[PDB]
Amino acid sequence: NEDHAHIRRLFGDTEEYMTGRLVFRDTKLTNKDDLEARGAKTLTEVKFENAINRVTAKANLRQMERVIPGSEFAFSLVYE
RNA sequence: GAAACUUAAAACCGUGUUGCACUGCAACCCGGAAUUCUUGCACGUCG
Structure with missing residues (x-):
């Protein structure tokens, strides 16, 4: 809510642009x-x-666990 | 004139629905903002 008027336009805030204009999604692995x-x-x-x-x-x-470096994810987002 | 009850007996009683029709109904997002992040050599020691 103290960000720029170009970041608070497509990402949301709670002052004057109450909703996003950008809908992100969860993403599963595709190339198993x-x-x-x-x-x-x-x-x-x-x-x-x-x-x-x-x-x-x-x-x-x-010990650390991490996803292998061959993975691919189906990226998508919507704009209103 | 003094002397002899227009009295006796007789229910303002019998029968009868405060009853018939009627939606507590129509319209309304538990919604808007937020990185499970910050630091870390699979390494040291050799009659």
């Missing part, structure tokens, strides 16, 4: 069969990371 056509087994990888110490270096572990 194209990923198992190649050599991909799981849709999400598991990545191990480290945090080293800058003196007498000892490290503690954490």
Whole structure:
């Protein structure tokens, strides 16, 4: 509500442009069969990371999960 | 003139729906704004 009049025009606010003009959507993954056509087994990888110490270096572990870099999503939005 | 009840007996009673027809109805978005984000070397030590 303190943004520009061009950002508060297509995104909403609660002062004078009460509704969007832009409708975003949720997006599922689409190319699942194209990923198992190649050599991909799981849709999400598991990545191990480290945090080293800058003196007498000892490290503690954490595990991160993320979507693989071959994925494709069906982007869409409406304008009124 | 003094002396002998226009008295006795007789229900203002019997029968009869405050009843018949009638929508608490028509019109109205629990709606508008908001990133599950910020920092982090799978690494150190070798008779």
